[PDB]
Design a protein around this motif. Sequence first.
Motif, PDB file in Angstrom:
ATOM      1  N   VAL A  58       0.852  -1.191   0.000  1.00 56.64           N
ATOM      2  CA  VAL A  58       0.000   0.000   0.000  1.00 56.64           C
ATOM      3  C   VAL A  58       0.885   1.237   0.000  1.00 56.64           C
ATOM      4  N   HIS A  59       0.686   2.111  -0.995  1.00 55.84           N
ATOM      5  CA  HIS A  59       1.338   3.419  -1.079  1.00 55.84           C
ATOM      6  C   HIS A  59       0.344   4.496  -0.665  1.00 55.84           C
ATOM      7  N   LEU A  60       0.775   5.355   0.257  1.00 55.05           N
ATOM      8  CA  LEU A  60      -0.007   6.538   0.632  1.00 55.05           C
ATOM      9  C   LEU A  60       0.460   7.660  -0.289  1.00 55.05           C
ATOM     10  N   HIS A  61      -0.334   7.924  -1.309  1.00 59.46           N
ATOM     11  CA  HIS A  61       0.049   8.827  -2.379  1.00 59.46           C
ATOM     12  C   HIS A  61       0.073  10.263  -1.878  1.00 59.46           C
ATOM     13  N   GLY A  62       1.243  10.881  -1.993  1.00 57.99           N
ATOM     14  CA  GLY A  62       1.491  12.229  -1.499  1.00 57.99           C
ATOM     15  C   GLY A  62       2.128  12.296  -0.128  1.00 57.99           C
ATOM     16  N   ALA A  63       2.399  11.158   0.497  1.00 56.67           N
ATOM     17  CA  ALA A  63       2.889  11.210   1.867  1.00 56.67           C
ATOM     18  C   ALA A  63       4.339  11.677   1.948  1.00 56.67           C
ATOM     19  N   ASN A  64       4.602  12.568   2.886  1.00 56.55           N
ATOM     20  CA  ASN A  64       5.961  12.800   3.366  1.00 56.55           C
ATOM     21  C   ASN A  64       6.190  11.727   4.419  1.00 56.55           C
ATOM     22  N   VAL A  65       6.880  10.653   4.047  1.00 56.31           N
ATOM     23  CA  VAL A  65       7.006   9.500   4.926  1.00 56.31           C
ATOM     24  C   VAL A  65       8.332   8.810   4.661  1.00 56.31           C
ATOM     25  N   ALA A  66       8.900   8.243   5.726  1.00 52.13           N
ATOM     26  CA  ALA A  66      10.098   7.424   5.606  1.00 52.13           C
ATOM     27  C   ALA A  66       9.863   6.293   4.606  1.00 52.13           C
ATOM     28  N   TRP A  67      10.936   5.922   3.897  1.00 52.28           N
ATOM     29  CA  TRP A  67      10.810   5.094   2.693  1.00 52.28           C
ATOM     30  C   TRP A  67      10.216   3.723   2.983  1.00 52.28           C
ATOM     31  N   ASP A  68      10.457   3.177   4.177  1.00 52.81           N
ATOM     32  CA  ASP A  68       9.985   1.838   4.502  1.00 52.81           C
ATOM     33  C   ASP A  68       8.509   1.781   4.865  1.00 52.81           C
ATOM     34  N   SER A  69       7.826   2.928   4.895  1.00 51.49           N
ATOM     35  CA  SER A  69       6.375   2.978   4.986  1.00 51.49           C
ATOM     36  C   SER A  69       5.767   3.642   3.759  1.00 51.49           C
ATOM     37  N   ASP A  70       6.547   3.837   2.690  1.00 50.68           N
ATOM     38  CA  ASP A  70       6.049   4.446   1.452  1.00 50.68           C
ATOM     39  C   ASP A  70       5.349   3.461   0.529  1.00 50.68           C
ATOM     40  N   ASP A 116       1.843  16.681  -6.625  1.00 50.10           N
ATOM     41  CA  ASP A 116       2.718  15.526  -6.716  1.00 50.10           C
ATOM     42  C   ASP A 116       2.532  14.729  -8.000  1.00 50.10           C
ATOM     43  N   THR A 117       1.564  15.092  -8.832  1.00 50.87           N
ATOM     44  CA  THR A 117       1.293  14.427 -10.094  1.00 50.87           C
ATOM     45  C   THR A 117       1.048  15.538 -11.097  1.00 50.87           C
ATOM     46  N   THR A 156      13.917  17.868   1.707  1.00 48.58           N
ATOM     47  CA  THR A 156      14.206  18.416   3.031  1.00 48.58           C
ATOM     48  C   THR A 156      14.495  17.364   4.096  1.00 48.58           C
ATOM     49  N   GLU A 157      13.925  16.167   3.962  1.00 52.00           N
ATOM     50  CA  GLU A 157      14.150  15.130   4.960  1.00 52.00           C
ATOM     51  C   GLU A 157      13.789  13.779   4.354  1.00 52.00           C
ATOM     52  N   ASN A 158      13.948  12.738   5.168  1.00 48.96           N
ATOM     53  CA  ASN A 158      13.599  11.357   4.831  1.00 48.96           C
ATOM     54  C   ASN A 158      14.421  10.777   3.682  1.00 48.96           C
ATOM     55  N   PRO A 159      15.746  10.706   3.812  1.00 45.17           N
ATOM     56  CA  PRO A 159      16.526   9.975   2.804  1.00 45.17           C
ATOM     57  C   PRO A 159      16.140   8.502   2.782  1.00 45.17           C
ATOM     58  N   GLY A 160      16.214   7.905   1.601  1.00 45.20           N
ATOM     59  CA  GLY A 160      15.845   6.514   1.444  1.00 45.20           C
ATOM     60  C   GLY A 160      15.546   6.179  -0.004  1.00 45.20           C
ATOM     61  N   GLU A 161      14.978   4.989  -0.180  1.00 53.02           N
ATOM     62  CA  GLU A 161      14.689   4.431  -1.494  1.00 53.02           C
ATOM     63  C   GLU A 161      13.246   4.745  -1.882  1.00 53.02           C
ATOM     64  N   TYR A 162      13.065   5.598  -2.888  1.00 51.98           N
ATOM     65  CA  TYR A 162      11.745   5.941  -3.391  1.00 51.98           C
ATOM     66  C   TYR A 162      11.695   5.684  -4.889  1.00 51.98           C
ATOM     67  N   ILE A 198       5.944  12.010  -8.581  1.00 46.79           N
ATOM     68  CA  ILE A 198       7.206  11.918  -7.855  1.00 46.79           C
ATOM     69  C   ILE A 198       6.861  11.670  -6.397  1.00 46.79           C
ATOM     70  N   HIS A 199       7.453  10.637  -5.813  1.00 50.54           N
ATOM     71  CA  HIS A 199       7.146  10.328  -4.422  1.00 50.54           C
ATOM     72  C   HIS A 199       7.875  11.300  -3.493  1.00 50.54           C
ATOM     73  N   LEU A 200       7.481  11.246  -2.222  1.00 50.54           N
ATOM     74  CA  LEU A 200       8.046  11.903  -1.034  1.00 50.54           C
ATOM     75  C   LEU A 200       7.860  13.424  -0.982  1.00 50.54           C
ATOM     76  N   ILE A 201       7.916  14.117  -2.117  1.00 55.17           N
ATOM     77  CA  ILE A 201       7.913  15.578  -2.117  1.00 55.17           C
ATOM     78  C   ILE A 201       6.620  16.093  -2.745  1.00 55.17           C
ATOM     79  N   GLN A 202       6.440  17.412  -2.668  1.00 54.67           N
ATOM     80  CA  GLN A 202       5.481  18.140  -3.484  1.00 54.67           C
ATOM     81  C   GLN A 202       6.260  19.162  -4.304  1.00 54.67           C
ATOM     82  N   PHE A 203       5.752  19.470  -5.493  1.00 57.63           N
ATOM     83  CA  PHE A 203       6.437  20.395  -6.381  1.00 57.63           C
ATOM     84  C   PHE A 203       5.477  21.478  -6.860  1.00 57.63           C
ATOM     85  N   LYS A 204       6.039  22.513  -7.470  1.00 59.41           N
ATOM     86  CA  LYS A 204       5.275  23.522  -8.191  1.00 59.41           C
ATOM     87  C   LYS A 204       5.578  23.388  -9.675  1.00 59.41           C
TER      88      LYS A 204
END
Length: 507
Positions: free
Chosen positions: A108-120, A462-463, A479-485, A420-426
């Motif tokens: 399960v992916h929480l779409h748009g989440a700022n979350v550590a990679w192992d719960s993405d 994010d899309t 800004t935070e949460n380095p990991g595999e996305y 794009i996971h983890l972040i939001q963009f403009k």
Amino acid sequence: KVDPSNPETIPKYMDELPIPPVARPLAEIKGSPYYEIAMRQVPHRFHRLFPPTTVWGYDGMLPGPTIKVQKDEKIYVRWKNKLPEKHLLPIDRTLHETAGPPDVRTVVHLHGANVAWDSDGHPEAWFSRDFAKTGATFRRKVYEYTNKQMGATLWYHDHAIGITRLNVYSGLSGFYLIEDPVEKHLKLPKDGYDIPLMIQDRSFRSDGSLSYPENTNPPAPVNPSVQPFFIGNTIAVNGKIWPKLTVEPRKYRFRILNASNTNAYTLRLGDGRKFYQISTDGGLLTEPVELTTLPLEPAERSDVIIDFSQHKGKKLILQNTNAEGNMGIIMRFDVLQPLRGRDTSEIPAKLISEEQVLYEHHADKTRLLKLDAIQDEYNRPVLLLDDRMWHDPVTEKPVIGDTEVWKLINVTNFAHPIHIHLIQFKILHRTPFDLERFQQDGYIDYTGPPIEPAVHERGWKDTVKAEPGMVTSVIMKFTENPGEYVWHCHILEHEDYDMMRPMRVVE
Ligand SMILES: [Cu+2]
Ligand SMILES: [Cu+2]
Ligand SMILES: [Mn+2]
């Protein structure tokens, strides 16, 4: 006689739009709610006059239950695969992780989440029934959502590698709402006047079963085979085909999500009636934006306020102007309920009190990323990001603290909604280029000035709709949460073959 496979036999507006129930936690540990949500195969009726359809639902319901949290409220969710051993839909065994058993793998992916990679919900973090077999990146049976982000309408859905298009089509999606602290002191429509709308296109066999292609037409020599699109012949909102919603003549907030596999919609209310956008994918805007049309690609969402008070006694069709005929209809609003006391809600002059600005000329890194297709050995298209397949060595390694501009160079003839996971963009802008010249030698020959994002897509997102024959540029800061996305097209038929790439966020 209603034949589910023949949309001309389906009487529209027979079903009152349902509101998914709110998920309830099973426990609370040191103030943190704990949820347990099981994926189950169940019957679901998509229309009043249909037989039941077998689907896959979170907690046995379609859409899945709505999860509600506050900004910064940490929650735990044990997502469980309680599905059968065999899939509902045809599996192409030439894709990732589909050569043999287990066929039914979920994550399960929480779409748009700022979350550590192992719960993405990484696509290789899938699990079969009761975690009996797990993918290479599997880490946690119980996910942790820290929710340190602006309030927003998010959504959760399956993301298992190789079969995401099948698991989402089977019914595995739901809403997840993060309440912003600002809302307590605004007067936005709330409670029963705050209604989520999950729009999805579907097709059915004559017996009511979900219909999903076994192969292309004309067919590939692979059987079953992926097809690089799915367009249904009915539109459902919250799991009901062409429904009506009976409303009072007052203001409502609608949380509008396109959760279709491929199809995009352009919403229009009645005869081009005005409505007021208050959020994009990533959260609230600075101030409401007057709209008369709202385009949404797969995974895009926007919250709007509609005022029905000037429409007492009217029925208003919510159109999809992208299509003719029945696919030009999403749902109907019937302004026929007597007002239940005074509308105290307001469309505010401002929504949030802080805005973060990112400037193109401050970019620490700029990425030129092509969207294209090649042909495989079976003469099928393979949709590719940056000339690369999922399993090719990682090339997107954004560094925490860096501002990045990504330029999505779409050399195909169709739009791709890039997530794009983890972040939001403009969205910075889109610039047309000469497609034939690029095809010749890779030179980007711009044929016009940059075009600003349209008025409905200026918030955090994010899309993004990457238009054909254009470079679509977006800006972001890690800004935070380095990991595999990952990052990928959200046309699921493209994501699964093979339009997804790793994103390794590094310190
Ligand atoms: Cu695509
Ligand atoms: Cu994704
Ligand atoms: Mn998604």
